[PDB]
Structures are given as C-alpha cells and as structure tokens.
Amino acid sequence: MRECISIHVGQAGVQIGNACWELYCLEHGIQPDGQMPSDKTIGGGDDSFNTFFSETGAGKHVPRAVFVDLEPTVIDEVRTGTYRQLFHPEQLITGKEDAANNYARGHYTIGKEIIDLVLDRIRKLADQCTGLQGFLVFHSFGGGTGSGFTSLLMERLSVDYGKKSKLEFSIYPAPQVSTAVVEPYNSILTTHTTLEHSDCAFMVDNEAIYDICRRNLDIERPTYTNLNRLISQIVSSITASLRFDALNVDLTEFQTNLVPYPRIHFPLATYAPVISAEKAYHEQLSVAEITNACFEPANQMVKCDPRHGKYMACCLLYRGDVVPKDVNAAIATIKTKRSIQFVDWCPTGFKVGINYQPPTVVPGGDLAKVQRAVCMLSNTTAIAEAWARLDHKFDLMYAKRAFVHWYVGEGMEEGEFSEAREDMAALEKDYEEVGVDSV
C-alpha cells in the first residue's frame, strides 16, 4: 500500500535513478535479477519495500519506475547495464532525438511525440498499485528533456491523476558541469511551469555536491558518477521512511511541516557524514557530530546561507544506530551553539525520525560505510538566493534576447519568458514576505 511511482526524465534523471535504484536494491537485499531471498512472500506482500518494488510469481522484485529520455544512449546503458534484468523493457522509454538543450524542443516539438506513451506506461504502473501515493520525478533544470518534457509530464500528471502527490528532485545547474549556455533560460521556464504542479521540490546544486566530493571524499575532479552516488544517499535517506518501517517517521508528516504555504515547497537538504573510507577507519561519528554536520553550511546540497534567512521548519531524518536520547542531547547542544532563528509564526522545534536500518554504500564507492547518518531538511528562506543567482543570469542574457530565437522558432513566445521571470520575481518576494516578523 501507498505505492510510489518513480519517474526519471532526462539523462540526469535517468542516471541518478540508476544510482538510487542500485542503492535501494542493496539496502533491501534485492539481487540484480530482482530475486530477494529475504522476502518469503512470493508474487506479492505488504512489506515497506513493496511501495517502491513490485513483485512477480518468480519472486523477482521489479522497481516501480519509468525511465524516459528522448535520446536512447542514456537509457540504453540501463538496458544493457548490470541491473538491466531488474527493470522491465516497457519501463525504459527512449525516442530518437534530444531537445538539443531547448525547453521549447522538449516541451512541444519533441515531447509531444512521446508524452502520450510515457503517461501510458505510468498508467499501467498505477493500476498495479492498490493505493498509489504520488510520483517521484527526477530531472535537471538545464536540459531540454529535464525542463521541457518534465513540465509537460507534470501538467499531464496533474490532469490525469488530479491532486495526487508529485515530489521532485531538480538538479540545480552548476557552471562547473554546465553543458549549455542557455541553461538559465530552461531553469526559469521549467520552474515557472511546474511550480503549480509540484507538491514538494528538493533542489540539488551540482556545484555544492561537486565541492562536497572534492573536500570530504578528496576527489580531484568529481564525475557525474560521484555526484550521483552522493545524491542517491540523500534520496535514500529521504525515502527511507517509505521503503523501510518504531522511531521511523513517514515523510508525509515532514511534508505537512515543510510547506507552510503552497509556493514555499522547496526545502533545503544537508546530509552527514560524508567521509572517505580511510578517514572513516578508526573514527566513530557520534549523533552529536553528524547533527552538527547537518547545521554546517558546507554540507548542504544547495549553496545558500541559512543565517542570512530564517527557518520555517527544520526536520532531522536519521538512520542507523541512533537513540532518541542522543538525538535530544545533540539537538540541545546545537541550540546552545547555533543561531537557528525561526519565523515567529513557526514553532521552534525539530521534528526527528530514527530509522534503525543502517546506511549502505555501493561497492567501489568512495563513501565509507558508517553506522549512523542523518539528513536534515529545512525550510529556510535562504533558498531564495538560489533563484536570485539564476534569475540574474536569466535577466543578463534575456536583456540582449540571446538564444531567444531558438525558443521562438520552436513556437514559444517572448511572453512566456517574461511571464516566467515575473513569477520567479514574485516567488523571491514571497520568500521575503514570509520572513517578515508578524505585526
């Protein structure tokens, strides 16, 4: 019950979804053929892992997700990858042409071709579910598939599934790994479009993840593989309440607390401890250490200063050998030392959950296995800085209407650009309003 269908749009979506799924197999004891020896129930069951993994007569535990990419290349490696047996052919959907980094191409010119087939596969998965809970969409703002097709699929899911949940894992563009000059355009436009169709959006800045790997993992030039593996750890901590089940707290309750107002649905995420296998050897990280780490600004997935802003919610999702008592101490300590300012309308509390299932690392990973990890999600107004930066780039190119012709030829109109930007400016003012102290 409470099944979740996972949707992975674009190259980034797809790859990050291959990271995640592998880690989830490793955590649940699912083998690459899908056979989970631990699971005695064959063809079905009600286990937490069944919300993300469906079962078959043979005992094979198929992932509940669909990989869509307008170029075959990325999903092709999945088709031929180690976990190719786990997935099912229909679940992998690939066209023949990419959106050449163009939102317009991916939303209209190309997307329209595959959109109906995609929704079709989702619908099949939806019928398998006894009580579907919502969708998990993974994409990148910068790419044409990750922006234009992703918004299209968001609208379609709104219509066809009504107000069912729709969470998101949006890859904030990072100049270090930038692939297109026009990525700020696609970012604004997709953010504008999906803002009304997303219940809760988690952004991950490639730059921030790139830094974390170089620093904590001592990687000279982190690859998309490094990022993805770190990303999957974050994702797994967030979804761990769903896939696993006394102290564990459903992410819904966190959601009811991380969205004070519909437009404010972007929470910041900070994970700990990211450590190399040498450094983790002969070092034990306390609940207090990992907890500090959460409040450390260099450990956050998005680059922003929480101090510059105010907290509207702050949740701590732990996993591993943790006990309430230690979590209470560490929190208090933090308090004594940190400046966790809260909006006046919001209660200055930390919602916690402890999932005793310990964390797992993919073999050959650069992440050392730890006995405890934590990932704090916070609704601080600092997130706006993000938008700003982006927006500012968008404004720079758009004043000289650069690359704008590429959008217009696909059929878009400058109105869409200006409208999208206005909405971002409103969102930024909304953050400022929520921080203002009550009269």
Binding site: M1, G131, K163, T252, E253, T256, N257, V259, P260, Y261, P262, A313, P324, K325, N328, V343, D344, W345, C346, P347, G349, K351, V434, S438
Partner: protein, 419 residues
C-alpha cells in the same frame, strides 16, 4: 447501565487498549475473556464495560483510518479479548488533518462505526452513554472523533457523552498544525460532550521527566500514567460500592454550567513497596505535580472536586485529610457551591499498589490549557500558515476564526467564575 467505549486514532487506540488491559486485570479477566478473580466484586459490575461461554468481551469499538494502529492492538496481549467485528478501520489515513477526518475521509467510515455502536447500544439493557478516547491534536481522533460524537448525539441524544481528550503539547508534538486540530476539536467537545477529561500530553511528560526521573520519556510512559488515571476515574463505575457513580450523576454533581465540563485529573502514588499514608496520598492527590493537566490549581478555584481512595485504609483518617485540605485551602474553593468536594473509598486497590488516590476537579485554572492552545493557533493563524492543508479539504478561514473565538469565550467563562 452499560457503557459503550469507543477509541479512535492512534493515540486513542493505544491508550484505550491499555485501559482495557488494566481494568481487565482488576476485574480478573484474562486475554481470552475468561474470569479467574478471587472476589465477586469483580464480577458484580463487570457489565458496565464488558458483555458475556461465560467470557466477558469489552464493550469497545475500535476506530481508525489506517490499519496499522488497530493491527498492533490485535497483536497486543488482550488483542484476543476485543471483539473482531468491533474492529472498524479504513486505509486512506487522515494525514493529520481535522478536515480529512471530520469532512473528507471520515464521512465514509463514520457510518460503518455508527452501525457497530448501534449494535452495542441495542444489546445494552440500559445504555448509560458512551466513552471516547482520542487525541485532540491529530487527524482521525481529533477530527473523525468529534464527528462520531456529533453523529452519536443525534442518534442517542438521551445518553451521556464523555471523552478522555489528550491535549497536544509542544513538548510532545508531531506536526506544526496540531494547535489547529486541537482548537477545532475543543469547540466540538464544548458542545457535544457532557464530560471531558483533559489529559495534557505535556504534563505527563513533565511528571515523567522530572518526578519519575525519566530523561527521554516515550509515549508508553505517558500512556502508563493515562491508563492509571483512567482506571481511577472509572473505578466508581466499575466496582460496586457506597457510591455507584454513573455518567449522569457524575455530570449532575461536577458540572455547574454546561460549557464548563473540562476536568483536571490527578493521581498518586505517581509510580514501590512503601504504601503511602492516607495523609501522603491526600497531599499528593491535590499536588499540582500529580495532576495530568498542566495547570496550577492555585492559579484558579475549584468549582467542584471528587476523590476516590482505592485500597485498604482508614476511612476516618481519609475524611480527616480531606477536611484538612479544604479548611487549609478554603480560598481555592468556590463559596457559591456549598460542599463542592466529596470523597469515596474503594476496597480493591489499583494493580500493584497497596492504595492510591484519584482526583477529578472542575477548576477554573483549566483555562490555562485552552489559553496555550489559543496562543499557538493565533500565532500561526495570524499569518495563515499551513492553512492550505485545510482549505484544500473545503474548509474556510471563517470556521478557524469561529473555533478560535469559542475557545477564547470558554477561557473567559472559567475566569468569570474564578473571580
């Protein structure tokens, strides 16, 4: 005079389950429903909460919008004793939204539940009324609970309605939106309950943390004080004696004015082999640190008070202690209600205690509790924070405004009489 017990939601189902276990022990009923008590007292009024292969079955209906909570109870020690048909739950869950329970996803199951209730009420020879357990600050029992109360009141408008309502607290909170759910529930109860025992999840913690010295109290800890308090208040109903209290008489003697039906429970010994002295029990019973509501009686004035002492003890010494308290604390007793305090003694002591004391008081101090909730509501509601989760269900800010107001009036009323 059977009492139809009804437990809704996680909290409601957890505390109610222990309550059954406790009173089953005292009444010598094991998990299978068979009886092995050494005294007939146990069987003399067992029908107040049980129906009889010479086995007693609790007269309890379990209600939840998610199976999990009810499935745990079924797996619990006494899970067998609870009648299987009385288990009544759905799968949607209430996502901690009064709305989702009082409007959207409860309107369905409510009917199913009313049917079991109807069945229990039919078998009952003389229906005393209904007993309900729930957490005012959640979703199923906060919202759906108050909905069932209203439905129940329409079908059985001649029956007493009593609720053990678990006031939410920041110390033990689950969601930021708990004040909202509490304020809505409070107003429901003000109108559709004759008796409401306010069990603040705050105090319980405190007691545990401070007094009982528990650094990290779990929900079980709090529940343990709750079950004890429950057994206390319900003693006079369960066990025969000089004062065979009943729901109606209980309301007739402790409720000077309708809206004022909210009581501060108190228990001692707050748990031990050293039985307390009748003076000790009496000083702890009225001790703030022994009340399950987080209000100071000294800050208000006792409209009415009712005490019970279980266990072998000197009835005379008991009466002397009570008299002393009243005489030393005359200022905390309303003059306009002559003889506003009364005590009763039961021979059968609580389980594992040589003797105990339970306190039930309609103190004007109870307003503190509602003021706390009202401030919270005000804080968030001034900025409309999180309101979209309710507006999405079809609710309207006006309704939040109304409930906010009513709870303020009720606070005012308690003060008026206080002064």
């Amino acid at each position: 005079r059977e009492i139809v017990h009804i437990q809704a939601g996680q909290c409601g189902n957890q505390i109610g389950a222990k309550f059954w276990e406790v009173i089953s022990d005292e009444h010598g009923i094991d998990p299978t429903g068979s009886y092995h008590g050494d005294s007939d007292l146990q069987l003399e009024r067992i029908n107040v909460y049980y129906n009889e292969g010479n086995k007693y079955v609790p007269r309890a209906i379990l209600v939840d919008l998610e199976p999990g909570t009810m499935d745990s109870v079924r797996s619990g020690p006494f899970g067998q004793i609870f009648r299987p048909d009385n288990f009544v739950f759905g799968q949607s869950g209430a996502g901690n939204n009064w709305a989702k329970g009082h409007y959207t996803e409860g309107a369905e199951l409510v009917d199913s539940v009313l049917d079991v209730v109807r069945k229990e009420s039919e078998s009952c020879d003389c229906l005393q009324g209904f007993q309900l357990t729930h957490s005012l600050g959640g979703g199923t029992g906060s919202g759906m609970g108050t909905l069932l109360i209203s439905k129940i009141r329409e079908e059985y408008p001649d029956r007493i309605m009593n609720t053990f309502s678990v006031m939410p607290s920041p110390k033990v909170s689950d969601t930021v939106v708990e004040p909202y759910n509490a304020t809505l529930s409070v107003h429901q109860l003000v109108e559709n309950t004759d008796e409401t025992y306010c069990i603040d999840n705050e105090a319980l913690y405190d007691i545990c943390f401070r007094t009982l010295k528990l650094t990290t109290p779990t929900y079980g800890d709090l529940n343990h004080l709750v079950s004890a308090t429950m057994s206390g208040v319900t003693t006079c109903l369960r066990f025969p004696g000089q004062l065979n209290a009943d729901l109606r008489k209980l309301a007739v003697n402790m409720v000077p004015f309708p809206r004022l039906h909210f009581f501060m429970p108190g228990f001692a010994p707050l748990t031990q082999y050293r039985g307390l002295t009748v003076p000790e029990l009496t000083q702890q019973m009225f001790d703030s640190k022994n009340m399950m509501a987080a209000c100071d009686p000294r800050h208000g004035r006792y409209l009415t008070v009712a005490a019970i002492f279980r266990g072998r003890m000197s009835m005379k010494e008991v009466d002397e202690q009570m008299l002393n308290v009243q005489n030393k604390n005359s200022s905390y007793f309303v003059e306009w209600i002559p003889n506003n305090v009364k005590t009763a003694v039961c021979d059968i002591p609580p389980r594992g205690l040589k003797m105990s004391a339970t306190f039930i008081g309609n103190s004007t101090a109870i307003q503190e509790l509602f003021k706390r909730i009202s401030e919270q509501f005000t804080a968030m509601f001034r900025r409309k924070a999180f309101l979209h989760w309710y507006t999405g269900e079809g609710m309207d800010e006006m309704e939040f405004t109304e409930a906010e107001s009513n709870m303020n009036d009720l606070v005012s009323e308690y003060q008026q009489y206080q002064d």
